[PDB]
Design a protein around this ligand. Structure first.
Ligand code: N7Z
Length: 266
């Protein structure tokens, strides 16, 4: 492992200043990274995982998270191991993409939406090239660095997100790059509906019977048949029939050149 890519941070080297959010997983803080022997204060997010009841295996996974080098995947900048695991990475000031599209739905055009689809596919393709499976891709796990630069987060963990999972993950706990492609399709559906909840009101335990019957998320009103057919291909039962992320980059890149042709907005 290339240890230099991962900073092991002392408690004095970072400060939690404000709360970004909390859940069963833990708490994320906005803060500053103040490296010793430097004259800089770096805006960061600090995620403190819930205390659990060892260090060598954690660092091994952290080394992998620090080794990711792609503009559309968040990189682990540093770690602090105490009673808890604290993860430090660059602050993404605009927050998660799901909240972003909900807050800006009136003001989001077709080029923005298609560009995000390209960027998310590029990040996922990078993870696949690294033989890394995400297992939790969703619009809530894409962060907005600036409005046209998004990055995937929450990879490397090593409420189950049933509504984003491929059928084989629900039924057999099989997770592959092709099940990530299923989740990518749901994520695109979230963006194209401006943050709607997938299968809203349906209990998680009912989702597999919906998929088994051939029912799928509906075509978003702004989506032409061309865009929706890509999404539906992501939800085929046969995982090897779903698109590859490499193919998704190409297709959405083509559509981003003529966005008005493929999304009908306003
Ligand atoms: C969509 C709702 C949402 O996610 N709300 C948010 C947003 C943030 C947030 C805002 N700006 C930010 N900049 C940088 N990071 C974060 N969050 C964040 C995410 C993951 C992190 O780590 C990665 C990781 C890897 C493996 C396993 C688990 N995590 C880190 Cl260090 C930071 C961010 C923050 C919180 C938040 O809501 C939290 C409650 C709902 O989850």
């Amino acid at each position: 492992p290339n240890q230099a890519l991962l900073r092991i941070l002392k408690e004095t080297e970072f400060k939690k200043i404000k709360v970004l959010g909390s859940g069963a997983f833990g708490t994320v803080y906005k803060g500053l990274w103040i490296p010793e022997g430097e004259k800089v204060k770096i805006p960061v997010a600090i995620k403190e995982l819930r205390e659990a009841t060892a260090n060598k295996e954690i660092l091994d996974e952290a080394y992998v998270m620090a080794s990711v080098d792609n503009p559309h995947v968040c990189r682990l900048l540093g770690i602090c191991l105490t009673s808890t695991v604290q993860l430090i990475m660059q602050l993404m000031p605009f927050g998660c993409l799901l909240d972003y599209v909900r807050e800006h739905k009136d003001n989001i055009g077709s080029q923005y939406l298609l560009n995000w689809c390209v960027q998310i596919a590029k990040g996922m393709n990078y993870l696949e090239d690294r033989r890394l499976v995400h297992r939790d891709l969703a619009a809530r796990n894409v962060l907005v660095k600036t409005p046209q630069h998004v990055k995937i987060t929450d990879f490397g963990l090593a409420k189950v997100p049933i509504k984003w999972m491929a059928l084989e993950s629900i039924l057999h706990r099989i997770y592959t790059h092709q099940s990530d492609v299923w989740s990518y399709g749901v994520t695109v559906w979230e963006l194209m509906t401006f943050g709607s909840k997938p299968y809203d009101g349906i209990p998680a335990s009912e989702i597999s019977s919906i998929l088994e019957k051939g029912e799928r998320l509906p075509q978003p009103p702004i989506c032409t048949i061309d865009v929706y057919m890509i999404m539906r291909k992501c939800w085929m039962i046969d995982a090897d029939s779903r698109p590859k992320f490499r193919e998704l980059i190409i297709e959405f890149s083509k559509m981003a050149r003529d966005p008005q042709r493929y999304l009908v907005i306003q």
